């Protein structure tokens with residue numbers, strides 16, 4: 001009850017900033033998350049014992065893959081924390097609860113393979129869930145963990161509030177399927193620019209949370225350049241393993257997954273900054289002005305990839 005989490009001074013200051021890196025000390029990441037729930041949501045939001053047990057079961061159900069791992073979960077939850085803390089009054093009590101949990105759970109039990117590889121492999125998950133295959137599985141794994149004995153962090157919510165929170169989490173997790181991002185952002189762009197965007201309209205709120213979820217998920221592109229560059233190595237370590245698995249099914253992978261085409265990474269990152277990242281943070285900044293530092297940091301990293309192409313690194 002009277003038991004705050006406190007971080008060392010550098011972390012207590014830097015954790016408030018969008019570009020914070022949670023560091024390489026895995027044993028501190030639960031503490032960093034509880035810290036973020038307590039300041040974001042309240043010390044009263046969750047029973048500490050239940051929250052701690054939930055967090056450690058979530059950790060156990062992330063695998064030792066190079067990128068879609070526990071560190072990614074916590075990283076994506078911190079970007080959400082920074083967005084919530086910079087937009088105090090725009091979000092409901094239930095959204096503040098749901099969204100940090102959604103972020104921590106959003107890639108539960110990821111294997112390091114795309115939806116497209118599961119479909120080509122004919123994985124059982126591709127028969128159970130025909131679109132957003134991994135994302136329906138992540139939501140399914142989240143409900144499983146919520147139902148383990150002593151793991152119900154939502155136990156004090158009413159039946160209908162509990163249903164609303166699980167519905168915020170489900171949509172937030174589905175929204176991380178980048179195939180859905182393009183259309184979501186076009187609609188948000190048209191709504192904002194024809195002045196029809198209405199944050200009292202639930203279906204609008206849903207779109208805006210989806211875009212937040214894309215922004216938090218891609219937040220590697222919003223770090224200081226040395227973090228961006230070293231995270232890129234983990235991202236490609238996954239993609240190139242999938243490429244290898246595609247070649248074992250007798251399928252030429254796309255170039256982003258082909259290790260024979262490493263030379264094309266700089267230009268491939270550029271396309272991605274221009275086609276996905278910059279548009280994402282631009283629309284997010286229009287809807288939520290205090291998220292502008294995410295857009296500024298992405299533009300800084302775009303210019304760093306331009307420098308790599310020009311042989312100045």
Ligand SMILES: Cc1nc2ccccc2nc1CC[C@H]1CCN(c2ccccn2)C1
Pocket residue numbers: 217218219220221232235255256257261262264265266267268269271272
């Ligand atoms: C899909 C993706 N998600 C990210 C999320 C966070 C940070 C960086 C990310 N980079 C990518 C890869 C973009 C792709 C677009 C094509 N591209 C290529 C193409 C050829 C060779 C290498 N990369 C890379």
Ligand SMILES: [Mg+2]
Pocket residue numbers: 106107134176177
């Ligand atoms: Mg995912």
Ligand SMILES: [Zn+2]
Pocket residue numbers: 072076106107176217
């Ligand atoms: Zn993710």
